Subunit: 281 residues, 2 copies
């Protein structure tokens, strides 16, 4: 489209390493109870360490399963939310984890990869960093791939309504993306599952489409979740999206009625972003 | 909740008929290519005709299958969009059909039932009209039942964000509902799949929750559709919902990229409501 899109990447690893030119690369895997998938994800990236990748961490976000110990056994440095930034009490949600991870990394470039991926290609990271290394003015790279109910029913239609320029983004909510530290530390971080959409919209509003690229990763598999759980995610995405569009959110959580006779449950929603990590230094 | 909710209805048909007190009841089944389900729906209601129900029509919305002939063979009066209101050229979408149906009916009370239902209970209509007949000040009755991806991910979360008072509505997009002619002819009709949500929000804004009821119909089955198709529906629901909340919609249709290599397709969206049918008389 009007967006820089690689529908098939082809840089070799040696070219990319050469292109670093003193710049460093950190990789962060946020993880909450992903014991089943975490090892395969770590193993897919660790051969790059001390070479193309200078740093790899798992940001453990309060797991109560064997996530941390399995990650350690895969040679990964595991960092709790508390260790990333101990002077600041921990809030729940993904955005907190990603924001904190900036304080636990040092790379000029930062790559995020979700830890719930089922057997990810070992070229995910090179493909994401390609445009940052060989491009001009690129500061953010989003992935896409080949059922994404929230993406196609919520985020993309809302983008069409309120930021149609971002209509060309195939996977705005993708947990796999890369960006410059300079950008990331200059942006606020939305709470919960709002974090990705916020970064995308803020980036666009600030630098326009020319600073954004997207790359095809092929076909990704993962643990599809419960509708009930995607309600809360959609709610936070909506809250975050409306905010960027200058629209006031009620702050009222989604309520759900579960049949058993029905019982009612209300999920939390947050209207508070974390500020740019820059202000913390 | 704060809403009048019958979690199990129990009026007998003779009580309801008595309660009519000179008021009449029309039933409308909108239909676009529903040949597989239309007969069962018609048959479920026709025993009520000349009794509780004074009038039953199928509003054929441009079907190219055997919908019309099968409906006729079930003893139903079939009315095209053109026959309902021939002086006015036809627009596409559900809202046009429902709006036009007001000109093809005469009942003081109007009941809508979707024609894509799989073997609906013959008590749907009595259950919906109950609160209008035996209640006070009720002008609109919505159904609910026991996976509704658009309802739980789009409409209910957006309602929480922008009209949290309607959070108690379990099925805001339900195609099965009943209302007074006086109300319906005083409201505009949103285009496409926006029609239900528009009527609900307009009703609430104008008369408040006390004029709205919802009733449990048990468990409904129907033809679940393609994500791609629910994209356009969500888009129109969003457009219609934002409008009622005073928020400008871009008017840009949802675009989708279909793998084959990808191909791109853009779906139509409409920001034009039909005005109250009253102005047409
Ligand atoms: O509270 C949370 C919830 C989500 N996740 C991460 O976000 C993804 C969704 C999962 O793979 C987790 O790794 C997280 O780090 N903290
Ligand atoms: O253009 C349309 C599309 C939808 N429908 C009706 O709305 C429901 C969805 C279907 O059951 C159809 O009967 C209609 O009347 N016209």
């Amino acid at each position: 489209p009007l967006d820089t899109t690689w529908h098939r990447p082809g840089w070799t690893i040696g070219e990319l390493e050469a292109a670093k030119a003193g710049r460093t690369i950190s990789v962060v895997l946020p993880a909450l109870n992903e014991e089943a998938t975490i090892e395969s994800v770590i193993d897919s990236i660790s051969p790059l360490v001390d070479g193309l990748v200078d740093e790899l961490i798992v940001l453990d976000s309060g797991s109560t399963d064997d996530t941390e110990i399995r990650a350690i056994a895969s040679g990964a440095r595991v960092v709790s939310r508390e260790q990333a930034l101990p002077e600041v009490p921990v809030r729940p949600g993904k955005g907190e984890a990603l924001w904190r991870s900036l304080a636990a990394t040092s790379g000029d470039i930062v790559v995020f990869i979700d830890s719930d991926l089922i057997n990810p290609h070992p070229l995910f990271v090179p493909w994401l960093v390609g445009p940052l290394l060989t491009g001009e003015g690129i500061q953010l790279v989003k992935s896409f791939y080949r059922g994404g109910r929230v993406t196609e029913l919520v985020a993309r239609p809302l983008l069409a309504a309120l930021r149609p320029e971002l209509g060309c983004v195939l996977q705005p909510l993708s947990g796999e993306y890369a960006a410059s530290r300079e950008l990331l530390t200059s942006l606020p971080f939305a709470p919960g599952y709002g974090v990705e959409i916020g970064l995308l919209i803020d980036t666009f509003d600030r630098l326009g489409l020319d600073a954004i690229a997207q790359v095809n990763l092929g076909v990704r598999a993962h643990r599809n979740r419960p509708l009930d759980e995607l309600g809360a995610m959609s709610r936070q995405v909506i809250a975050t999206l409306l905010s960027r569009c200058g629209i006031p959110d009620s702050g009222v959580g989604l309520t759900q009625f579960l049949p058993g006779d029905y019982t009612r449950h209300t999920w939390p929603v947050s209207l508070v972003d974390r500020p740019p990590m820059k202000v913390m230094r």
